[PDB]
Design an enzyme around this catalytic site. Structure first.
Site, PDB file in Angstrom:
ATOM      1  N   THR A   1       0.823  -1.203   0.000  1.00  0.00           N
ATOM      2  CA  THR A   1       0.000   0.000   0.000  1.00  0.00           C
ATOM      3  C   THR A   1       0.862   1.261   0.000  1.00  0.00           C
ATOM      4  O   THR A   1       1.886   1.323   0.677  1.00  0.00           O
ATOM      5  CB  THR A   1      -0.938   0.028   1.216  1.00  0.00           C
ATOM      6  N   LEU A   2       0.448   2.259  -0.772  1.00  0.00           N
ATOM      7  CA  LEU A   2       1.150   3.530  -0.853  1.00  0.00           C
ATOM      8  C   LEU A   2       0.423   4.651  -0.129  1.00  0.00           C
ATOM      9  O   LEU A   2       1.025   5.699   0.121  1.00  0.00           O
ATOM     10  CB  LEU A   2       1.362   3.919  -2.325  1.00  0.00           C
ATOM     11  N   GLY A   3      -0.842   4.452   0.214  1.00  0.00           N
ATOM     12  CA  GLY A   3      -1.606   5.414   0.961  1.00  0.00           C
ATOM     13  C   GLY A   3      -3.031   4.936   1.142  1.00  0.00           C
ATOM     14  O   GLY A   3      -3.476   3.992   0.489  1.00  0.00           O
ATOM     15  N   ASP A  59      -5.486  -3.026   4.404  1.00  0.00           N
ATOM     16  CA  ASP A  59      -4.453  -3.369   5.375  1.00  0.00           C
ATOM     17  C   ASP A  59      -5.059  -3.987   6.628  1.00  0.00           C
ATOM     18  O   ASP A  59      -4.496  -4.925   7.209  1.00  0.00           O
ATOM     19  CB  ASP A  59      -3.644  -2.122   5.730  1.00  0.00           C
ATOM     20  N   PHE A 109      -1.259   1.058   6.671  1.00  0.00           N
ATOM     21  CA  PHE A 109      -1.782   2.399   6.939  1.00  0.00           C
ATOM     22  C   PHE A 109      -2.958   2.329   7.914  1.00  0.00           C
ATOM     23  O   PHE A 109      -4.092   2.690   7.607  1.00  0.00           O
ATOM     24  CB  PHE A 109      -2.180   3.078   5.634  1.00  0.00           C
TER      25      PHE A 109
END
Lengths: 256, 247
Positions: A1-3, A59, A109
């Site tokens: 995950t990037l955000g 997540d 996140f």
């Protein structure tokens, strides 16, 4: 995950005289879009441990999978009720996962709450664990659990972890936590705990854009993990000045 | 033999793999395990009669019955370490299945995967084949009982009732008399104790308590794994013992 993409907002968990009361609205938002309005955000790990999350839903589902299989393997090796992993054990495990992912610059996140009962002396539920049947849904009374036997842990993205008598995530860290530091007390009854949690959720509904008033309450007590019936929280404005028509105010100037 | 029995990867001139047959002999010499399908559940029993002279072993500490997802019984006869290896693999396959699909691994797929794992250790000239046969079984209301037994050669077959290990022939002779699909697991308990008293000449009414593991998956246990409580095994043991001493 990037955000974050799909996110849940805030969770509140507090100790009361019969165990843990944890709450979260059943909402997951796609940005400012309230796409999912019936999402479960508090998960049962075992009969004495629950997991709540805020932040990214994917997540959180990953972590829930990890813990589900960890509890399964725990039950696979169990020979006595004492062998079951405590909430403290799961909190340590989650803090470790988060720390390892931070060191790779690959975090989940999420902010996580791990709560439950840190003792086996209050009941014999872990004598014969049922994964796929619930017997609560017999006519016994709750056991008063000493506060020291209860556990509420917190983990954030950087691996920061600690425990307390009440833990909040997201906007509850400002609105709910203020009222809790002002007003929480030990050995509250279910009624008082519920009233305080509802006041916090009402403030969140009025002040957090990502929140909703469809509340899921979960209890961890001598009877195990109990999911209450989701309910709509009644939230009325606390002033008639809000409802006053604009045309009754002076037409001149910055009257709005 | 004739030099053809030193490796699991050499066929004999008559087409037989002798290391596998020697493993079979080892398993047949080992302790007894059985699983039985009843009307409202399956019942598994392990008779640890090889440990009768081990007086200092902690009472009821050696158990050969495990479970996979709290709803599958897995037991064995043969080497403990190899069986633990295979059980670890079974649990690992169950974890992987849940991770991939979010539902529990079906019994028959799990059996196929375990049998393939076992079979893979019969193929190379540098790996010892597993010396254990495995019973894997489950039960639920709609499907009734499913019992599979996996051989060291890797062949899995489905049974209504199975006995592996020592004295298995006499146990099967006793088991086959009655149709247990119409008997309840509780009633089957006394039958099993009687069979143990007769078939295993190393077992008497003195060590029946500490030498036998009992577990079941049944309606009473909500179709999830459970070791039979001593408060259920005691009256059944006493009844079997008195009935036997009568004749």
């Amino acid at each position: 995950t990037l955000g974050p993409v799909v996110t849940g907002t805030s969770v509140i968990a507090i100790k009361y005289k019969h165990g843990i009361m944890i709450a979260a609205d059943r909402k997951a938002s796609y940005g400012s879009y309230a796409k999912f309005q019936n999402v479960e955000r508090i998960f049962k790990i075992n009969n004495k441990t629950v997991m709540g999350f805020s932040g990214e839903l994917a997540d959180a589902q990953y972590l829930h999978e990890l813990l589900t299989r960890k509890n399964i393997n725990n039950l696979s090796e169990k020979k006595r009720k004492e062998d079951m992993y405590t909430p403290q054990h799961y909190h340590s495990y989650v803090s470790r996962v988060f720390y390892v992912r931070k060191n790779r610059i690959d975090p989940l996140f999420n902010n996580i709450i791990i709560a439950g009962i840190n003792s086996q002396k209050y009941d014999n539920n872990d004598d014969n664990v049922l994964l796929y049947t619930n017997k609560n849904n017999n006519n016994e009374e709750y056991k008063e659990i000493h506060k020291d036997d209860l556990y509420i842990g917190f983990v954030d993205m950087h691996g920061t972890n600690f425990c307390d008598d009440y833990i909040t995530t997201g906007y509850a860290r400002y609105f709910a936590l203020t009222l809790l530091r002002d007003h929480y007390k030990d050995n509250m009854t279910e009624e008082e705990a519920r009233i305080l949690i509802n006041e916090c959720l009402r403030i969140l509904y009025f002040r957090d854009a990502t929140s909703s008033n469809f509340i899921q309450i979960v209890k961890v007590t001598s009877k195990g993990v109990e999911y209450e019936e989701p309910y709509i929280l009644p939230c009325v404005l606390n002033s008639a000045d809000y409802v006053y028509p604009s045309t009754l105010l002076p037409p001149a100037g910055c009257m709005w | 033999s004739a030099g053809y029995d030193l490796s699991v990867s050499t066929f004999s001139p008559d087409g037989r793999l002798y290391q596998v047959e020697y493993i079979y002999k080892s398993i047949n010499n080992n302790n007894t395990a059985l699983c039985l399908e009843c009307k409202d559940g399956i019942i598994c029993c392990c008779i640890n009669s090889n440990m009768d002279k081990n007086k200092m072993i902690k009472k009821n500490s050696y158990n050969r019955i495990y479970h996979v997802n709290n709803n599958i019984i897995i037991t064995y006869s043969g080497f403990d370490g190899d069986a633990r290896n295979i059980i670890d693999r079974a649990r690992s396959e169950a974890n992987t299945y849940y991770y991939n699909f979010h539902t529990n691994i079906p019994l028959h797929i799990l059996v196929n995967r375990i049998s393939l794992y076992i079979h893979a250790y019969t193929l190379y000239w540098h790996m010892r084949p597993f010396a254990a046969s495995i019973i894997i079984s489950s039960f639920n209301e709609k499907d009734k009982g499913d019992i599979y037994c996996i051989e060291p050669n890797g062949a899995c077959y489905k049974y209504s009732g199975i006995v592996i290990g020592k004295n298995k022939e006499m146990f099967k002779t006793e088991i086959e008399k009655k149709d247990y699909k119409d008997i309840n697991v509780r009633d089957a308990i006394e039958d099993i104790y009687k069979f143990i008293l007769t078939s295993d000449d190393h077992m008497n009414k003195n060590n029946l308590q500490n030498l036998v593991n009992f577990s079941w998956i049944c309606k009473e246990s909500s179709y999830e794994f459970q070791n039979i409580h001593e408060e259920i095994l005691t009256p059944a043991l006493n009844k079997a013992v008195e009935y036997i001493e009568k004749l």
